[PDB]
Structures are given as C-alpha cells and as structure tokens.
Design an enzyme around this catalytic site. Structure first.
Site, PDB file in Angstrom:
ATOM      1  N   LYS B 111       0.796  -1.221   0.000  1.00 58.79           N
ATOM      2  CA  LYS B 111       0.000   0.000   0.000  1.00 58.79           C
ATOM      3  C   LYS B 111       0.831   1.274   0.000  1.00 58.79           C
ATOM      4  O   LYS B 111       0.292   2.384   0.040  1.00 58.79           O
ATOM      5  CB  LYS B 111      -0.990  -0.008   1.158  1.00 58.79           C
ATOM      6  CG  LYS B 111      -2.193  -0.894   0.896  1.00 58.79           C
ATOM      7  CD  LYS B 111      -3.231  -0.797   1.988  1.00 58.79           C
ATOM      8  CE  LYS B 111      -4.380  -1.696   1.654  1.00 58.79           C
ATOM      9  NZ  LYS B 111      -5.366  -1.675   2.753  1.00 58.79           N
TER      10      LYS B 111
HETATM   11  C1  LIG Z   1      -2.855  14.682  -0.413  1.00 58.56           C
HETATM   12  C2  LIG Z   1      -4.233  15.273  -0.292  1.00 58.56           C
HETATM   13  C3  LIG Z   1      -4.386  16.768  -0.333  1.00 58.56           C
HETATM   14  C4  LIG Z   1      -5.320  14.491  -0.147  1.00 58.56           C
HETATM   15  C5  LIG Z   1      -5.265  12.974  -0.099  1.00 58.56           C
HETATM   16  C6  LIG Z   1      -6.688  12.453  -0.048  1.00 58.56           C
HETATM   17  C7  LIG Z   1      -6.769  10.938  -0.118  1.00 58.56           C
HETATM   18  C8  LIG Z   1      -7.194  10.168   1.110  1.00 58.56           C
HETATM   19  C9  LIG Z   1      -6.478  10.272  -1.243  1.00 58.56           C
HETATM   20  C10 LIG Z   1      -6.578   8.761  -1.295  1.00 58.56           C
HETATM   21  C11 LIG Z   1      -5.333   8.228  -1.899  1.00 58.56           C
HETATM   22  C12 LIG Z   1      -5.573   6.888  -2.561  1.00 58.56           C
HETATM   23  C13 LIG Z   1      -6.992   6.460  -2.873  1.00 58.56           C
HETATM   24  C14 LIG Z   1      -4.530   6.104  -2.865  1.00 58.56           C
HETATM   25  C15 LIG Z   1      -4.725   4.776  -3.537  1.00 58.56           C
HETATM   26  C16 LIG Z   1      -4.041   3.676  -2.745  1.00 58.56           C
HETATM   27  C17 LIG Z   1      -4.808   3.365  -1.473  1.00 58.56           C
HETATM   28  C18 LIG Z   1      -3.990   2.843  -0.299  1.00 58.56           C
HETATM   29  C19 LIG Z   1      -6.155   3.538  -1.393  1.00 58.56           C
HETATM   30  C20 LIG Z   1      -6.938   3.237  -0.149  1.00 58.56           C
HETATM   31  O1  LIG Z   1      -6.891   1.804   0.028  1.00 58.56           O
HETATM   32  P1  LIG Z   1      -7.528   1.190   1.276  1.00 58.56           P
HETATM   33  O2  LIG Z   1      -6.496   1.390   2.411  1.00 58.56           O
HETATM   34  O3  LIG Z   1      -7.873  -0.255   1.081  1.00 58.56           O
HETATM   35  O4  LIG Z   1      -8.775   2.066   1.649  1.00 58.56           O
HETATM   36  P2  LIG Z   1     -10.251   2.024   1.109  1.00 58.56           P
HETATM   37  O5  LIG Z   1     -10.819   0.643   1.065  1.00 58.56           O
HETATM   38  O6  LIG Z   1     -11.024   2.952   2.083  1.00 58.56           O
HETATM   39  O7  LIG Z   1     -10.177   2.681  -0.291  1.00 58.56           O
END
Ligand SMILES: CC(C)=CCC/C(C)=C/CC/C(C)=C/CC/C(C)=C/COP(=O)(O)OP(=O)(O)O
Ligand SMILES: [Zn+2]
Lengths: 401, 315
Positions: B111
């Site tokens: 991740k």
């Molecule tokens: C940097 C600024 C200003 C904002 C960031 C805002 C966010 C939280 C962006 C999300 C980043 C993202 C979706 C990255 C993709 C990789 C990832 C680890 C997504 C989330 O995965 P999980 O940890 O499984 O969470 P969810 O199941 O809630 O999507």
C-alpha cells in the site's frame, strides 16, 4: 439517535445468501458497530454523545512538540503532522501560543526547499503533499511571520516544474501523477496568489477525464472512483471555477451512495468498508456540490441541510470514532492517529454546519459543547483563515518571472 | 554483502569500520523543534549517515546499500528513493536484481506509493513488462482491491498493449467475488479500450451478463452501478424493454437499487419527451418518497432533492 432507533436494525447487510470476502468483511464491521450502538442499552445508561475535547486536546498539544519512535513512519510527513494538529486544535477552538506558532513557522522554513515548495522534513526534496500541508499550516497560524515564510516566486517556479503537457502535475520531480497533485497545486497557488494565466491550462480537462462510469473520480483516468481523489478533483475544479467540466449529477449520486445505511459513516469506494476519515473526503463533497449546483441556479436545493445524513454521520463519529485516551480513528478496534483526528473532526464540523448564501443551519448531535469551529470545504482550514490569507497575498502581485 | 537490518548481528553504522572515515550528519530540527520524533538508535543512525552521503553526493556502492536500510526504516521517504534511483544509474546496477528487490518490498508494503512508482520506473527503464501481470496477480490474490496494484495493472496494459487476456482475468476474479468493485471497474476499462460499448452485441452481452448477476446477488451495488454506467451513456430511456424487465424483479429481486434505478429511468424519460408524462412523473415522485421515507432513508436529503428537482422540471 437515528442509529439507535429500532427500525435501524433493518439496515443490516442482506447478503442474498451468497457470501464473498466483501459481504463477510462488511458483516464483521456491522456486527462490531451494532455492539457499539447497543452498549448503552446493555449497561442501562442514557446515551450521552460527548466529544472528549480535553482528551483530544492533551493528545494534540503534546504531539505538536514531540512524538515517540512509533511515528518514524511519518519522518517524511512532518508538515502533515503540523497541519493535522494545528487544524484539529483549530476545530477544537484551542489557541496557538505566539511562541508555538513562531516555532512551527521556523520549522516549516527548514522544510522549505530553496527551489520552491516544501519537503517532508528539514532537507528533504520538495513534494506537493507536504507543500500543501505546510501552506495550510502557515495559513491556520495566519501571522505575517507565517505568511512571509512562503517564498512565492520559487513556489510558482516549482509548480511549473511539475506541470505536464496534458494538464496534470507530478507530485514531485521524478515522481507520480494523480488528482491529488492538481488540488495541492490549485490550493497553494490560489491561497498565495501566484496563479498565472497558463498555470492551470488543461488541468480542468485532465481532472474531468478522471471521472468514470461510477460518477466518482479516480486517481488517474481509468481508475476506480475513490473518495480521497474525488474530493481533490472537485475541490480543485471549484478553485479553478470549472466544476461544470464534471457531470455533477452522476457525481452527486455517487457520493451520496457512499454513506453507509447502517454505520452512518462513509466508505471510500463502492463495496468497501466505512472509515472515519471519509467523514471529510466524501461528506466534504456535499457542500462543494451545493455551492456548484447553486451557482448553476439550482432551485431544488435545500436551505438548511447538506445532501447526506448529517445526524447519522455525527453519530458514527461520536459513538464509533473516538479513542477514550484522546484522538479519533478509522473505526472501532482501530488505533488513533493524528490523520484521523484531523479528518474525523473536520467531517464532524462539516456535518454540524450548513450554509448557502444567507442561510445558516447548524445540527449539533449530543451535548451542545460538541459544536466545533467551522471548516472551509475547499481548503479544510477555518473560513476566516482563508479570507485572511487570500486578502494578504492579494496585496502581493503574481510573480512575473 | 547485505547485512540485513533485521539481522541479529546487525551493527550500527557508527560501529562499522568501512564507514569510519565519514562523519554522520544529524538532522537540523531547529532550536525549538515541533512534531519532533524521538527516533530509535538504529533509525537515527542510518539517517544521520544517509544525510552524510547525500550531502556530499557520494555515489558509492556503500551508499547504495545504505539507502536500502533507510528505505526499510521508512519506505515513504521519497528523498531516499530518489537518491537510490540516482545510484542505480551511476553505479550501473543490474536492474533485474533491483526488480527482485522491489518485488519483495512491495509484497511487504503493498500500500506504499513509493514502492509501486519505483517498480514502474524500473519497467520503463528495462522496457520489459514480462513479469508484471503475474506479479500484480499475486498482490491481488492477497488483496483483490489494492488500488496501487490495479493502477499499475492499468498502466502496464495500456503502455505495453497487453489487452488480450484481461477480460478473462476479470471473469476469474468476478467469480471469486462478484462484489469486487475494482474488478467491475477493470471490466469497463478493458471493454471501453478494446471493443467499446457501441458495438450492439457487446452492449447486449454486457447488459445480459450484468442482469444475471443482479439476479444471483440482488443487493450487490456494483452490478447495479455497472448496469447504470454502461447504459447511462446513450440515455436510459433509449432502452424501452429495460424498464419492464426491471419492473418484473419488483417483487422477487427487489432491493432499493431496483427502486433507485427506476427513478433513474424515469428521470431520463421525462427529459426525453416520453408519453404519459404526468403519469411517469408521479411514479418517479412516488418512488422518491418511498425511498426518502422508507427504503433508503440515509439518503433522504438526496431523494427529496430528486423529488423537488423533478417537480421543478416536469411540473
Ligand atoms: C494529499 C491530499 C491533499 C489528499 C489525499 C486524499 C486521499 C485520502 C487520497 C486517497 C489516496 C488513494 C486512494 C490512494 C490509492 C491507494 C490506497 C492505499 C487507497 C486506499 O486503500 P484502502 O487502504 O484499502 O482504503 P479504502 O478501502 O477505504 O479505499
Ligand atoms: Zn481513514
């Protein structure tokens, strides 16, 4: 309490008797949440929704000065710890001693790269995430000392060094591209008044390509719609006044579908679990969509509420996302952290305060001491700080080069 | 000679002879530190030395081995990752051995953003995507919803044009978990970038495939969102048989998704000069109230808006 009503039990998952990793994990969550909702009944006390302000405050005021080696994983995210904490104290209405404020300013100066932008710590190469956090932190402090920390000419240069031909921006040199970079840039450039005519050329179009079949927005075109990316994409468009480049209706339908009928909090993407930080990324989108649709002269928009269940969200946050010891979290069983404290509080404030021109309508669940200072849905720093920072930097002219 | 950071016989850099010449550079946190981390002895040790080699831009094999330790202590330090790529080129390191390295760290920290970007940079340098789809499939076998893994998969497929077997892989994962939204997204990514949804047979194949899924797991929102997604293009009213076909699951496979889908079809009929406008409007307004009041109350404010908005339009 919406969550405690009897008919609320009807909101539990219906797996159609077809179990998959998805239904099984959700069920585990609902079961854990249900135990939390019913704790009152089982202990025969009256539910008392109280935001542990003092607990949250000791945790914050302390982390702002020093942290254990457990935080080594954030050694490259220090301007973030400053923003998360200073913003949490700001929502909690806790003041920053002029001595602490000056110290934060001095530290961020060490994080500032000679080539513009801020690094995640003293001497680290500049990156857009900590640049966004550093500028936001400095605006929360809002002193002339703070404002003067930011080298605006080098910052503009920096943004140009990341700008791409297709409209996107890299997060840092030799780095990746995603919707976050567009927002970090539009946020720092707008607040500091360094937006040149061509700086965001094609950016609105690039972000629009990140909107997919779901209605939400992915990190880059082709990717699954996500709450963090969707907030960044929409907020960036609002800054650039190009919200219309998105299909606001499909987006409105996607985000409202992300509120969990049972838990009351928001999930990051369809068929995933609820998470407290999304109280801001997802719920924060409603005020943005409100402002935009209203800009289009939408006559059917509410005059007192956001288009999500403010009550259920406030209940999930208050009952399920607080650590007794101080600090907020993802969900019951998860550990507290400064990220979640900032966003659970940020999402609570969005949930309590409504506004649309002349209209203002609060909704504070639990004890009225629960009401927090308001947060600007685009920048996620106090509205006053935004007005104050932009007015200040408008005294300065846009760097011409 | 990689003395593992986890090795029981690992010794601090300041106790290492082959490093005795260089003076470690400590971190400048200022006289009045804020959000100051009380680093462990090892962390503090590796970074003070990292700072020293970076500050003097020492592009050595020893510095290269050190960045690895600094990466393991904090894989999110993008400055270290950068210097590491600097050394990969200067020292002309075997990039295939580096792929083995990045394969291992990603398995441990799937991740982390830096680990995936680095792998991408390696694939670009070697112009070799041969191991990619298999490596990614192993990460997705552990977490079928890893966002970075799916993003990387999408980048490899589009870049190197590896489309031929992706729809099959998608079918495989949909069997494992028909509720995996990442897979429904991949399905749309593959189709729209290959045949497109204008091909009537494809559209028909997709709509029927999706309807069978809705029959098997009626409360699976992904299948519903996909159905709306692929038809929403041309406009839901463009498909007359669909309304009837859904109205049929009204008693059997009837979730609040079917109800919401009906209001969607209605919204589009009204906008496209449909017959029985007053009739259609009431039905859609009836459903908006059933939803707001009973079937989907968490979204009450949304469904009310839809109600108001619908009246305001086709009153
Ligand atoms: C940097 C600024 C200003 C904002 C960031 C805002 C966010 C939280 C962006 C999300 C980043 C993202 C979706 C990255 C993709 C990789 C990832 C680890 C997504 C989330 O995965 P999980 O940890 O499984 O969470 P969810 O199941 O809630 O999507
Ligand atoms: Zn979270």
């Amino acid at each position: 309490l919406y969550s405690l009503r009897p008919e609320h039990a009807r909101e539990r998952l219906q797996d159609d008797s077809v179990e998959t990793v998805t239904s099984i994990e959700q069920a585990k969550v609902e079961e854990k949440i249900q135990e939390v909702f019913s704790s009152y009944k089982f202990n025969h006390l009256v539910p008392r929704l109280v935001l542990q302000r003092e607990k949250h405050f000791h945790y914050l005021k302390r982390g702002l000065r020093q942290l254990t080696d457990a935080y080594e994983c954030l050694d490259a995210s220090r301007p973030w710890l400053c923003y998360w904490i200073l913003h949490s104290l700001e929502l909690l209405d806790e003041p920053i001693p002029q001595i602490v404020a000056t110290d934060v300013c001095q530290f961020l100066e060490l994080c500032q790269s000679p080539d513009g932008g801020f690094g995640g710590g003293p001497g680290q190469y500049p990156h857009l995430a900590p640049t966004y956090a550093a500028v936001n932190a400095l605006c929360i402090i809002g002193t002339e000392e703070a404002y003067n920390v930011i080298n605006r000419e080098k910052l503009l240069q920096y943004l140009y060094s990341l700008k791409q031909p297709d409209g996107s921006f890299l997060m840092h040199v030799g780095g990746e591209v995603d919707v976050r970079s567009a927002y970090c840039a539009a946020s720092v450039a707008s607040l500091t008044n360094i937006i040149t005519p061509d700086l965001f050329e094609g950016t609105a179009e690039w972000i629009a390509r990140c909107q997919n079949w779901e209605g939400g927005i992915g990190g880059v075109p082709g990717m699954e719609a996500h709450g963090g990316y969707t907030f960044c994409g929409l907020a960036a468009l609002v800054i650039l006044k190009k919200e219309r480049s998105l299909n606001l209706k499909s987006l409105l339908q996607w985000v409202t579908s992300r509120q969990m009928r049972f838990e009351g909090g928001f999930q990051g993407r369809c068929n995933k679990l609820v998470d407290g930080c999304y109280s801001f990324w997802q719920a924060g989108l409603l005020p943005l969509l409100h402002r935009a649709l209203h800009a289009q002269g939408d006559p059917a928009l509410s005059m007192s509420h956001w288009m999500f269940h403010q009550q259920a969200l406030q209940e999930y946050i208050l009952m399920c996302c607080q650590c007794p010891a101080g600090g907020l979290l993802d969900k019951p069983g998860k550990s507290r952290d400064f990220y979640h404290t900032c966003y659970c509080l940020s999402g609570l404030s969005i949930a309590q305060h409504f506004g649309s021109g002349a209209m203002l309508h609060d909704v504070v669940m639990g004890v009225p001491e629960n009401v927090l200072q308001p947060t600007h849905p685009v920048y996620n720093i106090g509205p006053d700080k935004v007005i104050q920072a932009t007015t200040h930097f408008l005294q300065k002219p846009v760097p011409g080069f | 000679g990689f003395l593992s950071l986890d090795s029981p016989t690992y010794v601090l850099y300041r106790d290492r002879a082959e490093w005795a010449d260089i003076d470690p550079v400590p971190q400048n946190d200022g006289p009045s530190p804020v959000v100051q981390i009380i680093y462990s002895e090892k962390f503090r040790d590796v970074y003070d030395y990292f700072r020293a080699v970076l500050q003097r831009d020492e592009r050595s094999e020893r510095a290269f081995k050190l960045t690895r330790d600094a990466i393991e202590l904090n894989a999110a330090n993008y400055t270290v990752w950068h210097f590491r790529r600097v050394l990969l080129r200067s020292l002309q390191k075997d990039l295939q051995e580096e792929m083995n390295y990045i394969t291992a760290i990603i398995e441990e920290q799937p991740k982390n953003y830096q680990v995936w970007h680095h792998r991408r940079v390696l694939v670009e340098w070697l112009k070799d995507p041969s191991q990619e789809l298999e490596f990614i499939a192993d990460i997705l076998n552990q977490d079928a919803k890893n966002y970075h893994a799916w993003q990387h998969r999408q980048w490899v497929i589009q870049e190197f044009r590896l489309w031929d077997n992706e729809l099959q892989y998608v079918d495989q994962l949909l069997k494992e978990d028909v509720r995996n939204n990442s897979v429904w997204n991949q399905r749309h990514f593959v189709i729209s970038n290959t045949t497109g949804y204008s091909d009537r047979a494809v559209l028909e194949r997709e709509v029927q495939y999706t309807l069978e899924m809705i029959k098997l797991v009626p409360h699976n929102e992904s299948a519903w969102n996909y159905l709306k997604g692929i038809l929403q293009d041309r406009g839901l009213s463009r498909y007359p048989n669909l309304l009837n076909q859904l109205l049929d699951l009204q008693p059997s496979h009837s979730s609040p998704y079917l109800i919401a889908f009906l209001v969607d079809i209605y919204e589009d009929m009204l906008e496209n000069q449909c017959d029985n406008k007053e009739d259609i409007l009431n039905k859609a307004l009836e459903l908006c109230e059933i939803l707001a009041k009973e079937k989907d109350t968490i979204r009450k404010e949304y469904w009310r808006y839809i109600g108001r908005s619908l009246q305001s339009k086709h009153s």
